[PDB]
Amino acid sequence: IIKIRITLTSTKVKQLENVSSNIVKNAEQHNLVKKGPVRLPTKVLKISTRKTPNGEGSKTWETYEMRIHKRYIDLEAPVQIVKRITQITIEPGVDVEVVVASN
Amino acid sequence: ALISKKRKLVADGVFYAELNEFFTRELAEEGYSGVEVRVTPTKTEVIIRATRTQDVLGENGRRINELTLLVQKRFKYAPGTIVLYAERVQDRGLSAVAQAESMKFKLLNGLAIRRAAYGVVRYVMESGAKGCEVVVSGKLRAARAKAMKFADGFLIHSGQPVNDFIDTATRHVLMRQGVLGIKVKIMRDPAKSRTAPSVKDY
Amino acid sequence: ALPEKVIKAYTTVGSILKTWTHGKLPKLFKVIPSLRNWQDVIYVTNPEEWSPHVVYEATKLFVSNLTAKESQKFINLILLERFRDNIETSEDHSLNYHIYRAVKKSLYKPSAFFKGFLFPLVETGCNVREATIAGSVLAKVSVPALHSSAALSYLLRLPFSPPTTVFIKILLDKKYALPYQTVDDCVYYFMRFRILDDGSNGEDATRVLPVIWHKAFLTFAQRYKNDITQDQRDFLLETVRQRGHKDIGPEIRRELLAGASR
Amino acid sequence: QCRVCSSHTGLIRKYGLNICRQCFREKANDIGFNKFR
Amino acid sequence: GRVRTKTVKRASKALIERYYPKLTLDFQTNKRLCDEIATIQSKRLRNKIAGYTTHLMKRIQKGPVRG
RNA sequence: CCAGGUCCAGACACAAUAAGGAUUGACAGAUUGAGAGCUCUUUCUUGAUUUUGUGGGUGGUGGUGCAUGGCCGUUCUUAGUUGGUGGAGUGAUUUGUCUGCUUAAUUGCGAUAACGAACGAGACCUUAACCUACUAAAUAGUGGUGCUAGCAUUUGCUGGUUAUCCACUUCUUAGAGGGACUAUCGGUUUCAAGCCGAUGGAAGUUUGAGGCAAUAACAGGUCUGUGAUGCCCUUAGACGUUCUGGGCCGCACGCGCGCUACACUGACGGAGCCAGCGAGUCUAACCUUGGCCGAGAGGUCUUGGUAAUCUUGUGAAACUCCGUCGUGCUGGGGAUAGAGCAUUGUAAUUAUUGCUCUUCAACGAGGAAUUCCUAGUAAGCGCAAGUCAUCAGCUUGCGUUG
Ligand SMILES: [Mg+2]
Ligand SMILES: [Zn+2]
């Protein structure tokens, strides 16, 4: 009996949604108590870049952009179930973090 | 270690990009297609998906340990925390002759008839094969011959892709009681093939 | 485990040595060659982030004050790895001058330099730039004849690569008095590239040899024509008549026919 | 400094990355920075 | 000027020379009409084609057109 | 970049010397000028590593040229061009590409010795603004219910409580879809594609923006890539190393980008007090809550956050009110300068920066001329992120008023 908080970070939303739906449909199917996938706001990471690498013309600017999404699902499970889900769920693009303590 | 989260992910992306460019420029003649890395709590595993694998592992793993030390020395890692894995062509679970000789040596060592079959099927299945089939025919330390077969995965049995994809090796292990038939058939990935109005009623 | 007094003292002198450029070495740094156990001491001093000046001065102290096996352990654990790091992490893939002076001075003891530096390098990823740099360093430093002979004899038994051919250049241009068995091993290295029609051939029989190998064949046939037998002379003539060069090959056969048997 | 092309000018020092901008402008997509808006 | 592209014009010309009678003056029916008959890869382009077929149903009901 | 002080040259070949001594190091001292060196007296390792002198050039971590392949930076920055077949002409050439009309467009219609077809542009991608309808939450918020605090009590108000429970996403957010297609009407137009005005709409200038191709041109830049490649010496040159000390800010000045002001829609003193884009520390010391000291600058003692959790509700400034000042280079302005106290830096003088007092310089809306701009836009105002060890008057964003 250990409570495990699993937090998922991903820049792509499709693989993150597939991972979260697989986690929810795997957790509900063998009778574990849990919370839903709590949806943090999407971080938008912006940086400014010159339009002029060379010194010709007037100075004007553009912006490069990123999108980062964060979800976290709280679980309650035994140790072997947590270990086998942590072995299964490793996919490229979605980062899986396992938290033991609740403080 | 212990990098802040956006800096951790951007430096991780630089780590993917630097190994991608290093393996693009290094093994250009060994069919380089892509890489993937797996981060375990024990160590870090590099999976080299290069389509000419027999030139990647040379004599007694010399170029494998060479590329392992190239990852080790430049990227500031402890000795033993990186393992570079070979996948595509010279994976030992994709050749039926190697697995037939392997289960030959496993039966000759004195293992079980079932547990060695579990080991060879799991080693073929974890190596990147679509399917496998194990045929053992013999006495099985008894007075009656038994024919008994186990297929795992998805395999084909007829057609022109039979002549293109499967590999079958026939071996005969010599036991203390008699002889036994060793047939290993391995199915590989076909995506790795590089070369008036009317009314009715009832 | 080490005592914590040694740990904090050598962590302190490791924190000192990051920006050393001139002057005298520290006193606790100059007694490590006098120690019976050097290797635990130098690991606490964080070996990877040394300054180039203490790399060269540690090379000077840890070559001029040690034995041969002690210096080869030093160069293989320290200087070879920092040599590799300072080439592949350099941005034009160059070498620093103090590191160049360190790799130059470490061949004052030649056997330790060979068996700690050169021989792991050729088997663990010797590319063009590393071997060009090391062949230049081996071109500068004057070596005795027998260490050149034995390191050349290791280079002959290596599998073929043009970096190994560059090392074979640098050790065959010394014009030293080799033993006759070293000339025999040079002959045996020059046997594995010819084509055998009896049904025993490898990768080196039909591969493309550049101009560098034929210059090496010219060099060996002009210096050591008088230290071969007639059977080896005929086998080298077979090697000439199989894979001779357009512009070097006639010179090699006319200088090989002008040699006397032993 | 920039460990691609020995660039001692045009560095950006954010996040401990020290690439010059003229090497960042073609290696951004391999790192993960893609042009969106 | 908001001159429509030639793909929308040609697709509407084909769907009105061949699939005249079920198209009408209502764009909202024509949207799922061109969903159920035409395989258009995007919602924007099928909205363009459905609005153009709605407009050609608007002027075809007053008289004949060259097509 | 200088003024000086030091190393380390040279691979290789040849000749004398050298073991009955050429000389490499650990030193302890004499040193040594500014600092390290350098050298010689011992205690010692010594042991060819040679010392000195001649010669093509090794060294190309010696570079410029010639051939290739190659990546990045520009342009005809292709936004109307080319080609196939036809016709016309001995040929250069032309028709396609046009009498007309229309469009933002060589975009179309129509007519026709032109008729096909490609890449241009149109188009593909990516963003925004509305969804009280979904599908859903202690790393967000609201409401109800407990326990509890203070006040009038006649019902109430203001709160606490990172779990006392319940409900929800109305606001916050992750999504699936919708929706817009110039919809409808009226003018205009061969009344053909289109354009303009009105209504509805969250959105009706192409609702607004940039990336992506094919093509012909770049002696553009290097790759520390390769080919007995042309050039100059091969080295007493420091293009290699170090050590200190100075700068790049020095000032009749011209030009340019900005800040602060010339004031009373204001300067000063109290009170009211509103944001968002962010960012933040490991094998180190970032963002800092809270408590003490100090006028302050700040110091000090602890704690939280490796982050929607803590800084932070960034209680920001301009602003709002109530008092002081009266048109007086004034209490506007704050240049310059001195003294002291603190902080960062190894080191603050040519004053790094911050605080206290004093000094209170020009400067009474600016000539010829000139910059930018059509709605949350100009302008004023602060804040955050980069340069960061310390400061911005540098740049990019954000928010407030408008
Ligand atoms: Mg023609
Ligand atoms: Zn660069």
Swiss-Prot record, chain A:
SMART domains cross-referenced by the UniProt entry: Ribosomal_S10 (SM01403)
Gene Ontology cellular component terms for the protein in this record: cytoplasm; cytosol; cytosolic small ribosomal subunit
Keyword tags: Acetylation, Cytoplasm, Isopeptide bond, Ribonucleoprotein, Ribosomal protein, Ubl conjugation
Annotated protein name in UniProt: Small ribosomal subunit protein uS10
Classification of source organism: Eukaryota, Fungi, Dikarya, Ascomycota, Saccharomycotina
Family, similarity comment: Belongs to the universal ribosomal protein uS10 family.
Pfam family, one: Ribosomal_S10
Function: Component of the ribosome, a large ribonucleoprotein complex responsible for the synthesis of proteins in the cell. The small ribosomal subunit (SSU) binds messenger RNAs (mRNAs) and translates the encoded message by selecting cognate aminoacyl-transfer RNA (tRNA) molecules. The large subunit (LSU) contains the ribosomal catalytic site termed the peptidyl transferase center (PTC), which catalyzes the formation of peptide bonds, thereby polymerizing the amino acids delivered by tRNAs into a polypeptide chain.
Organism: Saccharomyces cerevisiae (strain ATCC 204508 / S288c)
One of the protein's GO biological processes: cytoplasmic translation
Keyword field contains Cytoplasm: yes
Subcellular location: Cytoplasm
Cross-link entry Glycyl lysine isopeptide (Lys-Gly) (interchain with G-Cter in ubiquitin), positions: 3, 14, 83
GO MF, any single term: mRNA binding
Superkingdom field: Eukaryota
Listed NCBIfam families: uS10_euk_arch
Curated annotation (Swiss-Prot), chain B:
Biological processes annotated in GO: cytoplasmic translation; maintenance of translational fidelity; nonfunctional rRNA decay; ribosomal small subunit export from nucleus; ribosomal subunit export from nucleus
Pfam hit, one: KH_2
Keyword terms: Cytoplasm, Isopeptide bond, Methylation, Phosphoprotein, Ribonucleoprotein, Ribosomal protein, RNA-binding, Ubl conjugation
Signal peptide (residue range): none
InterPro entries on file: KH_dom-like_a/b (IPR015946), KH_dom_type_2 (IPR004044), KH_sf_prok-type (IPR009019), Ribosomal_S3_C_sf (IPR036419), Ribosomal_uS3_C (IPR001351), Ribosomal_uS3_CS (IPR018280), Ribosomal_uS3_euk/arc (IPR005703)
Domain (KH type-2): residue spans on this chain: 19-90
Residues where Phosphoserine is found: 95, 127, 198
Subcellular location: Cytoplasm
GO cellular component entries: 90S preribosome; cytoplasm; cytosol; cytosolic small ribosomal subunit; nucleus; preribosome, small subunit precursor
MF GO annotations: DNA-(apurinic or apyrimidinic site) endonuclease activity; RNA binding; structural constituent of ribosome
Stored NCBIfam families: PRK04191.1 (NF003219), uS3_euk_arch (TIGR01008)
The protein's name in its UniProt record: Small ribosomal subunit protein uS3
Organism: Saccharomyces cerevisiae (strain ATCC 204508 / S288c)
From Swiss-Prot, chain D:
Binding residue positions for Zn(2+): 2, 5, 20, 23
Textual note on the cofactor: Binds 1 zinc ion per subunit.
Any one GO biological process: cytoplasmic translation
Cofactors demanded by this protein: Zn(2+)
GO cellular component: cytosol; cytosolic small ribosomal subunit
Quaternary assembly: Component of the small ribosomal subunit (SSU). Mature yeast ribosomes consist of a small (40S) and a large (60S) subunit. The 40S small subunit contains 1 molecule of ribosomal RNA (18S rRNA) and 33 different proteins (encoded by 57 genes). The large 60S subunit contains 3 rRNA molecules (25S, 5.8S and 5S rRNA) and 46 different proteins (encoded by 81 genes).
UniProt-recorded name of the protein: Small ribosomal subunit protein uS14A
Gene: RPS29A
Range of the intact protein held here: 20 to 56 of 56
Swiss-Prot record, chain E:
Subcellular location(s) per record: Cytoplasm
Coiled coil: none
Top-level division of the source organism's lineage: Eukaryota
Subunit structure of this chain's protein: Component of the small ribosomal subunit (SSU). Mature yeast ribosomes consist of a small (40S) and a large (60S) subunit. The 40S small subunit contains 1 molecule of ribosomal RNA (18S rRNA) and 33 different proteins (encoded by 57 genes). The large 60S subunit contains 3 rRNA molecules (25S, 5.8S and 5S rRNA) and 46 different proteins (encoded by 81 genes).
Additional observations: Present with 30900 molecules/cell in log phase SD medium.
Record's function text: Component of the ribosome, a large ribonucleoprotein complex responsible for the synthesis of proteins in the cell. The small ribosomal subunit (SSU) binds messenger RNAs (mRNAs) and translates the encoded message by selecting cognate aminoacyl-transfer RNA (tRNA) molecules. The large subunit (LSU) contains the ribosomal catalytic site termed the peptidyl transferase center (PTC), which catalyzes the formation of peptide bonds, thereby polymerizing the amino acids delivered by tRNAs into a polypeptide chain.
Protein's name in the database: Small ribosomal subunit protein eS17A
Annotated organism of origin: Saccharomyces cerevisiae (strain ATCC 204508 / S288c)
Lineage: Eukaryota, Fungi, Dikarya, Ascomycota, Saccharomycotina
Gene designation per UniProt: RPS17A
Included stretch of the parent chain: 2 to 68 of 136
